[PDB]
Amino acid sequence: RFTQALVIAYVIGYVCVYNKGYQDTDTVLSSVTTKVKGIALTKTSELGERIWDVADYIIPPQEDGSFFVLTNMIITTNQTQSKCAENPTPASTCTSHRDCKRGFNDARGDGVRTGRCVSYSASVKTCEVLSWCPLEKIVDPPNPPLLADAERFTVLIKNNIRYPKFNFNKRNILPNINSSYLTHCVFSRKTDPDCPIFRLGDIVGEAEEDFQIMAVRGGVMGVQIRWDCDLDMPQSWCVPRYTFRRLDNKDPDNNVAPGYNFRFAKYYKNSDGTETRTLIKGYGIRFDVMVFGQAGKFNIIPTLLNIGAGLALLGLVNVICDWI
Amino acid sequence: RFTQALVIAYVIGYVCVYNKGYQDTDTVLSSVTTKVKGIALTKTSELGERIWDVADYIIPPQEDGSFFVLTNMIITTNQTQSKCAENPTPASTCTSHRDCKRGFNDARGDGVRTGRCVSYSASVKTCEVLSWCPLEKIVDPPNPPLLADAERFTVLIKNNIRYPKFNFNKRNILPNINSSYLTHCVFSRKTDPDCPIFRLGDIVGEAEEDFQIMAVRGGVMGVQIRWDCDLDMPQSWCVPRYTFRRLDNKDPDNNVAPGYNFRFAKYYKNSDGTETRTLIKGYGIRFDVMVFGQAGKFNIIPTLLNIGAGLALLGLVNVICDWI
Amino acid sequence: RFTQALVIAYVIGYVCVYNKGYQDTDTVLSSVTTKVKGIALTKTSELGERIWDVADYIIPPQEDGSFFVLTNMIITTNQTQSKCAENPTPASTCTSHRDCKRGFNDARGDGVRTGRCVSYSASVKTCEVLSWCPLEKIVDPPNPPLLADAERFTVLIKNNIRYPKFNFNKRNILPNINSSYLTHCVFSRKTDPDCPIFRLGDIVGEAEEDFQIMAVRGGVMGVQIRWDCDLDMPQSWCVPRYTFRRLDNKDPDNNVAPGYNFRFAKYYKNSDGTETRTLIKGYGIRFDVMVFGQAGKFNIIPTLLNIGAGLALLGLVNVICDWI
Ligand SMILES: *[C@@H]1O[C@H](CO)[C@@H](O[C@@H]2O[C@H](CO)[C@@H](O[C@@H]3O[C@H](CO[C@H]4O[C@H](CO)[C@@H](O)[C@H](O)[C@@H]4O)[C@@H](O)[C@H](O[C@H]4O[C@H](CO)[C@@H](O)[C@H](O[C@H]5O[C@H](CO)[C@@H](O)[C@H](O)[C@@H]5O)[C@@H]4O)[C@@H]3O)[C@H](O)[C@H]2NC(C)=O)[C@H](O)[C@H]1NC(C)=O
Ligand SMILES: *[C@@H]1O[C@H](CO)[C@@H](O[C@@H]2O[C@H](CO)[C@@H](O[C@@H]3O[C@H](CO[C@H]4O[C@H](CO)[C@@H](O)[C@H](O)[C@@H]4O)[C@@H](O)[C@H](O[C@H]4O[C@H](CO)[C@@H](O)[C@H](O[C@H]5O[C@H](CO)[C@@H](O)[C@H](O)[C@@H]5O)[C@@H]4O)[C@@H]3O)[C@H](O)[C@H]2NC(C)=O)[C@H](O)[C@H]1NC(C)=O
Ligand SMILES: *[C@@H]1O[C@H](CO)[C@@H](O[C@@H]2O[C@H](CO)[C@@H](O[C@@H]3O[C@H](CO[C@H]4O[C@H](CO)[C@@H](O)[C@H](O)[C@@H]4O)[C@@H](O)[C@H](O[C@H]4O[C@H](CO)[C@@H](O)[C@H](O[C@H]5O[C@H](CO)[C@@H](O)[C@H](O)[C@@H]5O)[C@@H]4O)[C@@H]3O)[C@H](O)[C@H]2NC(C)=O)[C@H](O)[C@H]1NC(C)=O
Ligand SMILES: Nc1ccn([C@@H]2O[C@H](COP(=O)(O)OP(=O)(O)OP(=O)(O)O)[C@@H](O)[C@H]2O)c(=O)n1
Ligand SMILES: Nc1ccn([C@@H]2O[C@H](COP(=O)(O)OP(=O)(O)OP(=O)(O)O)[C@@H](O)[C@H]2O)c(=O)n1
Ligand SMILES: Nc1ccn([C@@H]2O[C@H](COP(=O)(O)OP(=O)(O)OP(=O)(O)O)[C@@H](O)[C@H]2O)c(=O)n1
Ligand SMILES: *[C@@H]1O[C@H](CO)[C@@H](O)[C@H](O)[C@H]1NC(C)=O
Ligand SMILES: *[C@@H]1O[C@H](CO)[C@@H](O)[C@H](O)[C@H]1NC(C)=O
Ligand SMILES: *[C@@H]1O[C@H](CO)[C@@H](O)[C@H](O)[C@H]1NC(C)=O
């Protein structure tokens, strides 16, 4: 009786009202494109004073729902295919030419051995390798990071979503928005929530991380765009909701393999027409854009069905009162 | 009685026959690779007459189940790290050197201020910035699009699918197909449905869009490959089905942030051995290849189970006739 | 009675114990980054002796949960925008200048026709096209593959997973691992299962494929990282499990469109400051990193619920004994 009343207020309140069992349900199809904007300034020894724009710091220039911003670098310039001393390690160091077998090439060595034992320094000797030479120096990445200015960059996240079942199509560039707004706006929770242009700093900040620490060794940042919509409500809700979360760094007590980095090169022909190359070991933050969402709308079918499934339990309450 | 007959013809006709409840069900594992083929010809002022092949128009040259074809460009050549006037805006324009604070660098400005107010034109003056100079001119992208010839390009979409539960493996390159066929064929609904090489024009066309309009500002095109298979039927069905849909452009009344474009650069060392750079703001169509599918096959287990679940409702019909 | 005992030992043994119906269930959120390491050596006619490092063989240098390693190439150097004979085909060959309509450009031709019929050889004549010239020669890719040394490369697969429902975060770089270990280790089943650095050779090998065959025409390799965890057990299990599978090559009887390859270019300005280009048709193996997993943990709610659903069937056994 109070059991009846409980499970009857349950198959209406819980499952019909609260769990939206009067609704058909579809899940989102999404597409995103991104654009980063900004300049960073570096002074190092020696490129002189250097500026990095979007075509300098986004590697590759286009990905599907992901973007990588360069933050720190170690740059080795004027490399050519030639011979040089390996960088000194237990594995590399040597006393005589005998220590170095010609042709020996192991995954963690600087190249293919000549092999000759040659001076790496005044003090140390090392196997001579055929490689892109000079080798990249062995150093920690700059702190503060070279590309620190990246914190002030902005990224337009453009997102088209569709809900096939409902013939529903929307963009995260909302109808109350227009071109001029995008000429100025930068997303803020308080004053500009509808601006789909985010300061990178703000993204990692809102995830409770510090851009200028992260930009040293790099990392991975998630951007979740959630479109959860009641289409029984007007089409004016069904707006996306952004949340930001740092994706790497699972056991932060660890100094083991921190951050994100990769090597890439730029190639040139010099005077003689022999390839010379610039190698960059870049650190940066990969930004993963992930889109989710579910749209309900009223249909009688799952309502009836859910009610039918509801009475089956609601009566079996009073049935199991006796049936034990 | 007619209620019985109705819900009994239901647990056979609806759920056992029509809804394939006699079947185990697995979902597809897929892998795709793509290849674009074609040349486009441009004449502009002034590169001279120029040809663009696959290595020119596909950025980057390889992605996982996505490919981007360049369609329109704005090209700024001979850039060097140097000083120049910002492009004139409310934000950039100035009267005195005082208007420009040295070092000021905002995300939407052309570079880092010197700062000096310098002539942009006869009429206007603008903050001098340290940047890649000259700056990209401010213009609309060419209509007709530079790379219009891209409409005639072809793309081989190669797709390997597998169904783990059924030990089932197939390719969208069908057994009735062979090498010569691929030497000539281009996919058509009527004469060549089994040719997995598609004219780009035909893809966007079949989605009811116009290539030569889209190629102006760019866009995103979906290609859905659906493998839905009854493996009780011979392995000769279980063929993929292609449908094409334009992914961006949710509220087409909008002039706000239309299409798809990105900036990318090519780098050179000049005589003096100082980096000079070509910058392209490219527009194009990203093609997203999306693969789905479900394979059923006969198993007794879910058949029995579904029947058992069927009688429970079929009898409870006659039970709720009285039980109200 | 033995029916009762059977279906009661079933709703405990099968569904409560074996199917873990006492458990809440969440599925994995994952992020991966990768790093390839190694040098390959080539001798060909004629680049001289050549070394390929990570920045040479990984195209593009960064992808999201995928990496492509170059294995074989066909390299055409010193290309310029200029006129040359098309490569001889039924489509290309000709007798008179009339055979070649100026401006004719079809997707499978080498360029835009001048059109002039010009000597391709002593024996054959072919339409002159405006193209990047000389054209890439028509040949099979080298066997053995140029980049065979790639078999010995290593790849660090770094994987961060999270389970939102359980506030659970882990990395595939396990707590019992540290920096030095990564300085030396290479994953083996027997001696080094916890080393997340894999020899490429071993990956394709363990999938029962032969690296030096695959590296000729290229291919697609899957790497599945499965995190399936009982969090009722200590956090010390909940380790990932790696399995490797070749993704392409569905109907291996086929010589039709085998492997994986793409064209890409490197651009240079020569003396005169006219663009010259190197074109590579590269073959290689794309490595797809795919992460899955499910975590259960004890909650009373689905336990009670499952038991309630269990008695409904357990009694209806004895009910349908009579009710037929
Ligand atoms: C293009 O799209 C834009 C974004 O949707 C539009 O901007 C929006 O425009 C409306 C008005 O056009 C803004 O409305 C607000 O109204 C409040 C009260 O206004 C009242 O003032 C009158 C005085 O004469 C009075 O008679 C009436 O009562 C009238 O209604 C204002 O107080 C309010 O100002 C502030 O409001 C928010 C703070 O809570 C904040 O969102 C606003 O931020 C905006 O301005 C600052 C700079 O001024 C920037 O930092 C932001 O980037 C942003 O532009 C502001 O601080 C405001 O006037 C509404 O705020 C505004 N939305 C935003 C966020 O801009 C444009 O109208 C569209 N343009 C065209 C051509 O249609
Ligand atoms: C490699 O793989 C290819 C694709 O599967 C194969 O091509 C297929 O080959 C068969 C025959 O080998 C084609 O069969 C069709 O048969 C019809 C009737 O043929 C009859 O003709 C005889 C006359 O002597 C008669 O005795 C018999 O009755 C015999 O059966 C033909 O009418 C038909 O022609 C048209 O059929 C379709 C139109 O509805 C259309 O698909 C065809 O398109 C093809 O041809 C045009 C150019 O001619 C191209 O635009 C297309 O690209 C395509 O090649 C054609 O218009 C046809 O002969 C079957 O059509 C064909 N499939 C396709 C699509 O090519 C090759 O046989 C394989 N090669 C090898 C070495 O095995
Ligand atoms: C950083 O992280 C590393 C990986 O977790 C750690 O390495 C691990 O360290 C422990 C010991 O520190 C290794 O433990 C094993 O213990 C066995 C028995 O040891 C016994 O020997 C004593 C003799 O005085 C005796 O008193 C005690 O009974 C003592 O317990 C050893 O037999 C065993 O050797 C072999 O064990 C495995 C074979 O079944 C195999 O995994 C090992 O491989 C390792 O060594 C070879 C080269 O020697 C390499 O090819 C591998 O790459 C690997 O390094 C070995 O063959 C071993 O000592 C445990 O094996 C080891 N794990 C691995 C895989 O290295 C480091 O300790 C951490 N470093 C720091 C600073 O903490
Ligand atoms: N294929 C690979 C990739 C990584 N490493 C090693 O794995 C450890 C951590 O990876 P990572 O953080 O990426 O190394 P880095 O600090 O960037 O150093 P390295 O320049 O050697 O990659 C390093 O000792 C690195 O040398 C390796 O030996 N084999
Ligand atoms: N990080 C970004 C990216 C975009 N934009 C602005 O967002 C608007 C629309 O984006 P998009 O269509 O990509 O701009 P474009 O027409 O290509 O112009 P722009 O060259 O400035 O990117 C433009 O006013 C653009 O300048 C911005 O201010 N901040
Ligand atoms: N857009 C495309 C892509 C592929 N092909 C043709 O499809 C067949 C097989 O594809 P693939 O294995 O990638 O060709 P390749 O052997 O690499 O030859 P090609 O250099 O012509 O691409 C070849 O005859 C290729 O020329 C084509 O005509 N149109
Ligand atoms: C480039 O390398 C050469 C030797 O290969 C060396 O002499 C010189 O330092 C480098 N040139 C420049 C531009 O510094
Ligand atoms: C490149 O820039 C210089 C000045 O930096 C200018 O004199 C010239 O127009 C450019 N050279 C070419 C190739 O046009
Ligand atoms: C580059 O091409 C020119 C003609 O365009 C040719 O003379 C020469 O073989 C090439 N130069 C080199 C570096 O071999």
C80 C-alpha to ligand 9 centroid (Å)? 9
In 3D, which of B169, B187, B60, B220 has the Cα closest to residue C286? B60
C108-116 LR contacts (CB < 8 Å, sep 24+): C108/B37, C108/B154, C108/B183, C109/B39, C110/B39, C110/C84, C110/C86, C110/C135, C111/B39, C111/B51, C111/C84, C111/C86, C112/B39, C112/B41, C112/B51, C114/C83
C43 φ, ψ (degrees, to nearest 5): -130, 120
Query: Do residue A268 and residue B264 have CB atoms under 8 angstroms apart?
Result: no
User: Distance between alpha carbon A65 and the CA centroid of its chain, in Å?
Assistant: 9
Contact C285, C66 (CB under 8 A): no
Query: How would you label B288-312 residue by residue, b for 16+ Cβ within 10 Å and e otherwise?
Result: bbbbebbbbbeeeebeeebbeebee
DSSP label of B45: T
Q: How far apart are CA B309 and CA B318, in angstroms?
A: 16
DSSP label of A187: -
Q: Which helix (H) or strand (E) holds B216?
A: helix B211-217
| Cis peptide bond N-terminal to A60, omega within 30 | yes
Locus of tokens 């803020």: A188
How far B272 CA sits from the closest chain C CA (Å)? Answer: 12
C169 C-alpha to ligand 3 centroid (Å)? 27
Q: How far apart are CA A163 and CA B222, in angstroms?
A: 15
Among protein residues, the one whose CA lies closest to atom 3 of ligand 5: A156
**C70: chain B residues, CB-CB within 8 Å:** none
Residues 6+ apart with CB under 8 A from A119: A85, A125, A126
Q: How far apart are CA B218 and CA B210, in angstroms?
A: 11
Tell me the best of A78, A269, A277, A279 to mutate to test the pocket of ligand 7, counting ligand atoms within 8 Å of each CB and taking the most. A78
Q: Which amino acid makes up residue B112? A: V
**A53: chain B residues, CB-CB within 8 Å:** 131-132, 263
Q: What length does chain B have?
A: 324
To the nearest 10°, report the CA torsion of A99, A100, A102, A108.
Answer: 140
**A199: chain B residues, CB-CB within 8 Å:** 107
Query: Do residue B254 and residue A53 have CB atoms under 8 angstroms apart?
Result: no
Contact C213, C205 (CB under 8 A): no
In 3D, which of C29, C54, C127, C42 has the Cα closest to residue C87? C127
How far A177 CA sits from the closest chain C CA (Å)? Answer: 32
Residues 6+ apart with CB under 8 A from B70: B52, B56, B57, B58, B59, B147, B150, B282, B283, B284
Strand pairing report for C219-226 and C275-292: parallel
Contact A127, A100 (CB under 8 A): yes
> Could you tell me if the CB of C188 is within 6 A of ligand 3?
no
Nearest CA in chain B to C63: B63
Q: Which chains touch C (3 or more CB pairs under 8 A)?
A: A, B
Tokens encoding B177? 């197909």
Among protein residues, the one whose CA lies closest to atom 5 of ligand 9: C80
Q: How far apart are CA A59 and CA A284, in angstroms?
A: 10
In 3D, which of A162, A190, A160 has the Cα closest to residue A173? A160
SS3 category, C183: helix
Q: How far apart are CA A70 and CA B154, in angstroms?
A: 34
Residues with CB under 6 A from ligand 8: B 78, 80; C 273
Sheet harboring A23-27: ordered strands across?
Answer: A23-27, A294-298, A229-230
Residues with CB under 6 A from ligand 4: A 108, 257, 261; C 35-37, 154-156, 182-183, 197
SS3 category, B150: helix
Q: How far apart are CA C24 and CA C224, in angstroms?
A: 24
* Residues within 8 A of B (CB atoms), C 110-149 only: 110-112, 130-132
Contact B266, A61 (CB under 8 A): no
Among protein residues, the one whose CA lies closest to atom 33 of ligand 3: C191
In 3D, which of B307, B293, B318 has the Cα closest to residue B230? B293
A302-309 LR contacts (CB < 8 Å, sep 24+): A302/A21, A302/A22, A302/A23, A302/A24, A303/A16, A303/A21, A303/A22, A306/A11, A306/A15, A306/A16, A306/A21, A306/A22, A307/A11, A307/A16
Q: How far apart are CA C317 and CA C311, in angstroms?
A: 10
Nearest CA in chain C to B197: C107
Q: How far apart are CA C28 and CA C161, in angstroms?
A: 7
Instruction: List residues in chain B that are followed by a break over 2.5 Å (C to N).
Output: none
Exp. method = X-ray
Contact B199, B150 (CB under 8 A): no
In 3D, which of C161, C33, C52 has the Cα closest to residue A283? C33
Contact C70, C50 (CB under 8 A): no
Q: How far apart are CA B236 and CA B98, in angstroms?
A: 77
Tokens encoding B289? 């290849």
Q: How far apart are CA B255 and CA B274, in angstroms?
A: 41
Chain A within 8 Å of C81 (Cβ-Cβ)?
Answer: no
Chain C within 8 Å of A262 (Cβ-Cβ)?
Answer: yes
* Ligand 9 atom closest to the CA of C82, numbered from 1: 5
Q: Which amino acid makes up residue C193? A: P
A246 C-alpha to ligand 4 centroid (Å)? 22
Q: How far apart are CA B181 and CA C198, in angstroms?
A: 40
Instruction: Give, in order, the Cα–Cα distances in Å from B300 to each of B306, C13, C312.
Output: 10, 22, 23
How is chain B split into domains, by residue range?
Answer: 1-23+298-324, 24-297
In 3D, which of C296, C215, C309 has the Cα closest to residue C24? C296
> Could you tell me if the CB of A8 is within 6 A of ligand 5?
no
CATH code: domain A24-297 is: 2.60.490.10
Locus of tokens 């040139």: A268
C200 carries a ligand binding annotation: no
Q: Thinking of the domain A1-23+298-324, which architecture would CATH place it in?
A: Orthogonal Bundle (1.10)
Tokens encoding C238? 């909940």
Q: How far apart are CA C279 and CA C266, in angstroms?
A: 7
Residues 6+ apart with CB under 8 A from B115: B97, B99, B100, B101, B102, B103, B104, B127, B128
Q: How would DSSP label each residue in C227-245?
A: --EESSS-TTS---EEEEE
**A160: chain B residues, CB-CB within 8 Å:** 220, 247-250
**With the C-alpha atoms ordered C187, C192, C196, C197, is the resulting torsion angle positive or negative?**
negative
Q: Which helix (H) or strand (E) holds C226?
A: strand C219-226
In 3D, which of A127, A313, C220 has the Cα closest to residue B161? C220
Tokens encoding C25? 């269930």
User: Distance between alpha carbon B6 and the CA centroid of its chain, in Å?
Assistant: 48
**Element counts in chain A: helices (H) and strands (E):** 6, 16
Q: How far apart are CA A156 and CA C302, in angstroms?
A: 43
In 3D, which of B155, B144, B153 has the Cα closest to residue B215? B144
C207 C-alpha to ligand 3 centroid (Å)? 28
To the nearest 10°, report the CA torsion of A144, A149, A152, A156.
Answer: -120
Give the Cβ contact number of residue A270 at 10 Å.
12
Strand pairing report for C154-163 and C168-171: antiparallel
Among protein residues, the one whose CA lies closest to atom 28 of ligand 6: B183
Radius of gyration over every alpha carbon of chain B, rounded to an integer in angstroms = 30
Contact B222, B246 (CB under 8 A): yes
In 3D, which of B148, B146, B132 has the Cα closest to residue B74? B146
**B316: chain A residues, CB-CB within 8 Å:** 312
To the nearest 10°, report the CA torsion of C69, C75, C76, C81.
Answer: 0
Chain C within 8 Å of A59 (Cβ-Cβ)?
Answer: yes
Give the Cβ contact number of residue C219 at 10 Å.
27
To the nearest 10°, report the CA torsion of B21, B24, B29, B35.
Answer: -60
> Could you tell me if the CB of A35 is within 6 A of ligand 5?
yes
Query: Do residue A257 and residue C61 have CB atoms under 8 angstroms apart?
Result: no
Residues 6+ apart with CB under 8 A from A160: A30, A31, A32, A169, A170, A171, A172, B220, B247, B248, B249, B250
Query: Do residue B60 and residue A55 have CB atoms under 8 angstroms apart?
Result: no
